[PDB]
Structures are given as structure tokens and as C-alpha cells.
From a paper:
To investigate the molecular basis of HD improvement resulting from the [name].4Q mutation, the X-ray structure of the new [name] Fc was solved. Chain (A) contained an IgG1 hinge (starting at Asp221, with Eu numbering) and an IgG3 CH2 and CH3 domain with the [name] (A) substitutions, as well as the [name] mutation in CH3. Chain (B) was engineered with an IgG1 hinge, CH2 and CH3 domain with the [name] (B) substitutions including [name].4Q. We named this construct [name] [name]-[name].4Q Fc. [name] [name]-[name].4Q Fc was crystallized, and its 3D structure was solved at high resolution. Analysis of the [name] substitutions in the engineered CH3 domains revealed identical side-chain orientations for the majority of amino acids (∼87%) compared with the original [name] Fc. Interestingly, however, the side chain of position Arg90 in [name] (B) changed its conformation, leading to an additional ionic interaction compared with the original [name] Fc, potentially contributing to the favorable HD levels (third versus fourth panel from the left). A direct link between the change in side-chain conformation of Arg90 and the [name].4Q or [name] mutations could not be derived: the environment around the [name].4Q substitution showed no structural alterations, with side chains ([name] substitutions and others) keeping the same conformation as in the structure lacking the mutation. Similarly, substitution [name] did not induce any structural changes, and the side-chain conformations of positions in its immediate surroundings remained the same. We found that [name].4Q induced partial disorder in the Fc of homodimers carrying the mutation, as well as the excessive formation of half-antibodies—two phenomena not observed in [name].4Q-containing heterodimers that were stable and undistinguishable from nonmutated heterodimers as seen in the crystal structure reported herein.
Author numbering:
A (entry chain B): 237 to 443
B (entry chain A): 237 to 444
């Protein structure tokens, strides 16, 4: 060290305009003898100076951790702009630059399908709803279950997986009480992806 | 080198009695100066002698590759016996030993549910059938699609995913031509897992 790791914003933050997408530049193994760290940020080479550099906190292996958060514009990230964090310290010989950007490739809209429970699974008290999300590119996506405008607890969403034609797919399944399903509660699968209109679609199901 | 790599049998081979599960011991970086490789095999530390060692095969980097195959008994593998491959070579200072066995943990039976397509997807030329396999342990499993006793291999299956209660889940979905679904062809999801009765279950669906 001192090593440098640069992290992208999360898909939902880049897709919803009210949220705050951040590029996070984490520096570790910053020593006691040479503690000074200078963060220089760039957007397609153009230097920018609005990064909140949080103060260097000590880790119990006796080296400081230093985080610099650059807030990005949603459209810049989505248009494939490159974000470069330049770190400089007296311990390291020459500056460590790292660059990230959105995954490249032509955007493809997800198709979203919901499946009600099996008649066989209705025997059990716990019951499964499935949201199938297919044909999307890039893999950056948010898929979430809700009911009555609130998040639904007991679900799992697998990672996006490549199909043969280059696009991605996943399933999300929600485990609900049989009684909630049988009394007609509406459950919705919300999908956020850059290739959807308004970056958002929702599909609902009920008995 | 030399370097040794030891590979387990595939779940479907361990689970179907007619099939032939094999543990495979591969040696690479075997030199021309010391080409003699001796395999010794052990099952829970007791030496066994039924391995079939293939003749050394020269590679394009001027080293030999030597493979030894031990056929295992299905029940031995499923009972958690340890298979050790011991490789002796003159270039090595001591023999290289590698050991493998089945993933540990209490077996849990998958529940299997099949879901027929969305009426919205019927607009497309292709259609999706979903097989939901949940609550299984260990993650070693084989999930396959078929119709009329023959494989339907245009599917994708998510890797086993860890649930909250310790067990694994996955989905597999089959991409079929719309016409085949509407004609009433029966499609089946076959699941092979050690915790199922007879190591196998099948769930089917068609248009009703
Ligand atoms: C002293 O202690 C230091 C701190 O560690 C604590 O750890 C405890 C367990 C314990 O040990 C304590 O004593 C100690 O206090 C320690 O620092 C560590 O140094 C390591 C380097 O040796 C770092 O390893 C790297 O980790 C990366 C992954 O980081 C994440 O996930 C882990 C957990 O899995 C987590 O610990 C980290 O904090 C980090 O979490 C992510 O954090 C970001 C930023 O905040 C989040 O993103 C933000 O999220 C917010 C909302 O919260 C918002 O959405 C913002 O938009 C967004 O910015 C993430 O959400 C969060 N992710 C989570 C939780 O999952 C790895 O990427 C990295 O791998 C790369 O480098 C390896 C070699 O170093 C290489 O082998 C590997 O292949 C990979 O290489 C890269 O590959 C990429 C492509 O795949 C390429 O693009 C790259 O170019 C390429 N890079 C290369 C080759 O360099 C690596 O494993 C470790 O992160 C760090 N720990 C922390 C906490 O920072 C220090 O080492 C210790 N010192 C000594 C001397 O011992
Ligand atoms: C000289 O040339 C040598 C030969 O190479 C040719 O390759 C050409 C492409 C080209 O380069 C030619 O010029 C060249 O001739 C070359 O040999 C190579 O050495 C490498 C090491 O330096 C080896 O790397 C390892 O590979 C492992 C994976 O191997 C499989 O997959 C690859 C493809 O991804 C494939 O090429 C291999 O053949 C091998 O295939 C598997 O084969 C087995 C046995 O047949 C099959 O199992 C059988 O299947 C049948 C049905 O057919 C039946 O079901 C039976 O039941 C069953 O026995 C598999 O189906 C098949 N798998 C496939 C195709 O995917 C890696 O796992 C291994 O990684 C591990 O070790 C690393 C460190 O050493 C570590 O970093 C890594 O994390 C990993 O760690 C392990 O983790 C495990 C837990 O997850 C632990 O249990 C382990 O303990 C742990 N090990 C550790 C930490 O060490 C590694 O990368 C390479 O395989 C080998 N190539 C061949 C062809 O043998 C040589 O290096 C060259 N020398 C020089 C000096 O250049």
C-alpha cells in the first residue's frame, strides 16, 4: 500500500433522479509516518472539485482508511462518462490513478413477468410468488417486491445471468403467508433499469 | 511443478445408480527428465487398487499430463467417504497428496414447483416455463428440462443461492416456441438431489 479501490454508484441511485449516486474512492494502508492523502477527481479528463473527503479513520491494524465520495450526475453516469480518482501520498512512489465507468454495451429493455403460486404449494402455509426478468442489458438492475406502497420482507433475488444472445435474466421470488394471498392482497414486482421508459416498470398480481 | 489437481464426480453421476461417478486426479508439469508418475489411491485412508491410469500425454509446452480415474461407489460418495490421490514423482521432494469428499451438512429435500407462462409473454414467439427449486441442502443438484422422454436443453438455471434458513434455492426456466405450448405438449422439470426419495423427482405442466 497505500492501495486504492474505486467503486461505482448503485443502479437504483443512478436510475431514480431524487436519489444520490456516488462514486466512492477508498484508500487503505495509509501509514502513520506518511498520513497525507490528496484526492484529485476527473470526469472524462475534466478536473472537478465537489468531492466530500471524509476524515481519515484508524483501523485496528494501525493504518488509516480514507474515503472520498464524489457525487455524480445521473445522466453523466448513464451516458458513459469516465470517473478517475487520483491518489497521492509520500509513502507511495508515483500517484495511483483508477478509473471507472458504466458497463459498456447497447441497452436492452427487460421483459417482466409475474407468476402466481402453484396449486400444490397452496397446501403449505408459506407460498411463493415469482417475478421473471429477462432480456436486459446491461446487468445493472434493481428488482424489488412490494405491497400497498411498502417493501415486502421475505424475498430473494438471484444475480443476473447471461443468456445465449448476450442479454441478462434473473428471477425474484417472494415468500408470503397463504392467508395474505387468499384474501386478495396485491403484490407488485418493481423493476428499475436504464432501458425502461422512465427507468421504471411495475407488474402486479393477486388471487 | 509437478502440480496435482483432484476433481469430484458430478452430482447426476453420484445420484443415478446406472451412471458412473468418477474422481479424477490430474498431474501437470511432469518433466521429460522425470516422467514417471505413481498414483496411490485411498478411501478413508485405506488404499484401493481399481484406478485406471491413462498413459502420459505430451503437452505443447513440453510437459506431460497424466490422469488417473477412480470409479467410486455411489453410496460411498454419498456417505461422505474421503478420496485421497497421492502422486509420487522424482522431481518432487515429497509426494503430493490431495483429498476430496462430498460437501458436508445435513441433507434437506428440495420442494419443486413449476409455473406456467404469463399471458403477456404469449405475444412473443418464445415462451418461458419456470421451475422453482427451494429448501435444499447440500447445493449439489441437477435440474433438467424434458418433454416426451427427451431433453429440452434451451434453458438456463441460476446457481444455487443461499436462503435465510440455511438451505439453497434456484430457478430454471425453459425457452420454448409458443406453438409447442399451445398445442398441449407436456414439459417436465426433473430434479436430482440426494435428499429426495429415489434421488429424483419430476414435475410437469401443460396448457389446460
Ligand atoms: C487494515 O484494515 C483495513 C480495513 O479492514 C477491516 O477489515 C476487517 C475484516 C478487519 O480485518 C479489520 O481489522 C479492518 O478494520 C484493510 O483494508 C482492506 O484492504 C483490502 C486490500 O488489501 C481491500 O480489499 C479489496 O476489497 C474490495 C471490495 O471492497 C468491499 O467489500 C468488502 C467486503 O466484501 C468491504 O470490507 C469493503 O468495505 C468494500 O465494501 C464496499 O464499499 C464501497 C465503498 O463504500 C461501497 O460502495 C458505496 O456504497 C454506498 C452505499 O453504502 C453507495 O452506494 C456508493 O455509491 C458506493 O460508493 C460498496 O457497497 C461496498 N461493497 C460491499 C459491502 O460489497 C475488492 O474490490 C478488492 O478486489 C480487487 O483487488 C484485489 C487485490 O487487492 C484483487 O485480487 C481483486 O481481483 C480485485 O481486483 C480488481 O478487479 C476489478 C474487476 O473485477 C478491476 O476493476 C480492478 O482494477 C482490480 N483492482 C486491482 C487489481 O487492484 C480487494 O479485495 C479491502 O476492501 C479493505 N477493507 C476496507 C474495509 O476498506 C487493510 O488492508 C488492512 N491493512 C493491513 C496492513 O493489514
Ligand atoms: C503446460 O500445459 C499444461 C496443460 O495445458 C493446456 O491448456 C491449453 C489451453 C494450452 O495452454 C496448452 O498449451 C496446454 O497444453 C498446463 O496445465 C494446467 O495447469 C494449471 C495450473 O498451472 C491448471 O490450473 C488449474 O485449473 C483448475 C481447473 O481445471 C479444469 O478446468 C479447466 C478449464 O477451466 C480445464 O482446462 C482443465 O482440464 C480442468 O478440467 C476439468 O477436468 C476434470 C478432470 O477430467 C473434469 O472432471 C471430470 O469430468 C468427467 C467428465 O468429463 C467426470 O465428470 C469425472 O467425474 C470428473 O473427474 C472437469 O469436468 C473439468 N473441468 C472443467 C472443464 O471446467 C482450477 O480449479 C485450479 O484452480 C485452483 O488452484 C489455483 C492455484 O493452483 C487457485 O488459484 C484456484 O483458486 C483453485 O483453488 C482450489 O479451490 C478448490 C475449492 O474451490 C480447492 O479444493 C483446491 O484445493 C484449491 N487449490 C489450490 C488453492 O491450489 C487451477 O487454476 C490447469 O487445469 C492445467 N490444465 C490442464 C489442461 O490440465 C500447465 O500449467 C502448463 N505449464 C506451464 C509451465 O506453462
Amino acid at each position: 500500500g497505500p492501495s486504492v479501490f474505486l467503486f461505482p454508484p448503485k443502479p437504483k441511485d443512478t436510475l431514480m433522479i431524487s436519489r444520490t449516486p456516488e462514486v466512492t474512492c477508498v484508500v487503505v494502508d495509509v501509514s502513520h509516518e506518511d498520513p497525507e492523502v490528496k484526492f484529485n477527481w476527473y470526469v472524462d479528463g475534466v478536473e472537478v472539485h465537489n468531492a466530500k473527503t471524509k476524515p481519515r479513520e484508524e483501523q485496528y491494524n494501525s493504518t488509516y482508511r480514507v474515503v472520498s465520495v464524489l457525487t455524480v450526475l445521473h445522466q453523466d453516469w448513464l451516458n458513459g462518462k469516465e470517473y478517475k480518482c487520483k491518489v497521492s501520498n509520500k509513502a507511495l512512489p508515483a500517484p495511483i490513478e483508477k478509473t471507472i465507468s458504466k458497463a459498456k454495451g447497447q441497452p436492452r429493455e427487460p421483459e417482466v413477468a409475474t407468476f402466481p403460486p402453484s396449486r400444490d404449494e397452496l397446501t403449505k402455509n408459506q407460498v411463493t410468488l415469482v417475478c421473471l426478468v429477462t432480456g436486459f442489458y446491461p446487468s445493472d438492475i434493481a428488482v424489488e417486491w412490494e405491497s400497498n406502497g411498502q417493501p415486502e420482507n421475505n424475498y430473494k433475488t438471484d444475480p443476473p445471468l447471461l443468456e445465449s444472445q448476450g442479454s441478462f435474466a434473473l428471477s425474484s421470488r417472494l415468500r408470503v403467508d397463504k392467508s395474505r394471498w387468499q384474501q386478495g392482497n396485491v403484490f407488485s414486482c418493481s423493476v428499475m433499469h436504464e432501458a425502461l421508459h422512465n427507468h421504471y416498470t411495475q407488474k402486479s398480481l393477486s388471487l
